[PDB]
Design a binder for this molecule. Structure first.
Ligand SMILES: COc1cc(-c2cncc(-c3ccc(C4CCN(C)CC4)cc3)c2C)cc(OC)c1OC
Ligand SMILES: COc1cc(-c2cncc(-c3ccc(C4CCN(C)CC4)cc3)c2C)cc(OC)c1OC
Ligand SMILES: COc1cc(-c2cncc(-c3ccc(C4CCN(C)CC4)cc3)c2C)cc(OC)c1OC
Length: 283
């Protein structure tokens, strides 16, 4: 039989230290192709090892298609091929868009749903998985208004995370590294930051905040590990909740939720399943 492997690369939709992401075509359908830098080969190996262990399938997890290694004259080429989401990243989308109550809740509940799916061990099933680099650039927006979580290159089953989103126990190096629940609690911290980024863009009473990344007001661009440790660990700062949120029942509830993802004590933080339940009871 014919195995039509050929993917056509059409347009570059992202370039970084990781490598590049392209919109490609396979058999008349868009696919996303991540081409890894030599610098980041371990991320390809880790995501490939995870998908060889468990074929995750969930509407809020970026859909796997293929992992390809191709021998070149003097190098190895590494591609990850996934579903393509033409609306792009949540980071991209929030710059560009304000939200209403329904669209804000649908975004955050879809992220919580993908995250709880990663975190839960299913017997018969899947191992429990922590993401370890959750952020708005690692979330894609789908046409149906839900999101999906991308990039399992740092994931752990039972490179460091983006410093802006690191939990206090990562920055102060107290994290219990032999305890898998520690990694779930680091993802919950990061989720709370994402929830804050999104909520800012939800309109209430004709008011909205401009898009800003977490801690925009207290650290530089490309903040150092020390910059983040001083804010998060030493001073114990948390993102600002604007007064205008307290006139809106949805934003009032989301402010409480994000506070319960940001406790200094990792074991006090809400679980992804508890976050889901709370979000289903808002509005
Ligand atoms: C090698 O590389 C790539 C291959 C493909 C691809 C193209 N046509 C057909 C296939 C196919 C799938 C599944 C079977 C099954 C059929 C049932 N039987 C009991 C076991 C075997 C056979 C063939 C594939 C996998 C796409 C790629 O990119 C999207 C590839 O490159 C990454
Ligand atoms: C990698 O990705 C894609 C692959 C394909 C594709 C191409 N040829 C053959 C297959 C296939 C056929 C049959 C079996 C099964 C069915 C019965 N079972 C009991 C055992 C064997 C598995 C696989 C597929 C899935 C299509 C895709 O899109 C339409 C793909 O996505 C881009
Ligand atoms: C985060 O991580 C990964 C993401 C993706 C991915 C999947 N669908 C779509 C995209 C995308 C498409 C289009 C735009 C822009 C371009 C045009 N316009 C200016 C606005 C929209 C942005 C982004 C991406 C980047 C794939 C990945 O792997 C294959 C990723 O790595 C795991």
């Amino acid at each position: 039989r014919t195995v039509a492997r050929d993917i056509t690369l059409l347009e570059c939709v992202g370039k970084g230290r990781y490598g590049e992401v392209w919109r490609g075509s396979w058999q008349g359908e868009n696919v996303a192709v991540k081409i890894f830098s030599s610098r980041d080969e371990k991320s390809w190996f880790r995501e490939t090892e995870l998908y060889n262990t468990v074929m995750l399938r969930h509407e809020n997890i970026l859909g796997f298609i293929a992992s390809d290694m191709t021998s070149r004259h003097s190098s190895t080429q590494l591609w990850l091929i996934t579903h393509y989401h033409e609306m792009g990243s949540l980071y991209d989308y929030l710059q560009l868009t304000t939200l209403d109550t329904v669209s804000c809740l649908r975004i955050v509940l879809s992220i919580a749903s993908g995250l709880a799916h990663l975190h839960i061990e299913i017997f018969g099933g899947k191992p429990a998985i922590a993401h370890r680099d959750l952020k708005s650039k690692n979330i894609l927006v789908k046409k149906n208004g839900q999101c999906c979580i991308a990039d399992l290159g740092l994931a752990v089953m039972h490179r460091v995370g983006t410093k802006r989103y690191m939990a206090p126990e990562v920055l102060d190096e107290t994290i219990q590294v032999d305890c898998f629940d520690s990694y779930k609690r680091v993802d919950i911290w990061a989720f709370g930051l994402v929830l804050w980024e999104v909520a800012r863009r939800m309109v209430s009473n004709g008011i909205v905040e401009d898009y800003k990344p977490p801690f925009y007001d207290v650290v530089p661009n490309d903040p150092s590990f020390e910059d983040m440790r001083k804010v998060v660990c030493v001073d114990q700062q948390r993102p600002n909740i604007p007064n205008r949120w307290f006139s809106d029942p949805t934003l009032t509830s989301l402010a409480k939720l994000m506070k319960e993802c940001w406790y200094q004590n990792p074991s006090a933080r809400l679980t992804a399943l508890r976050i889901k339940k709370t979000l289903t009871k808002i509005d």
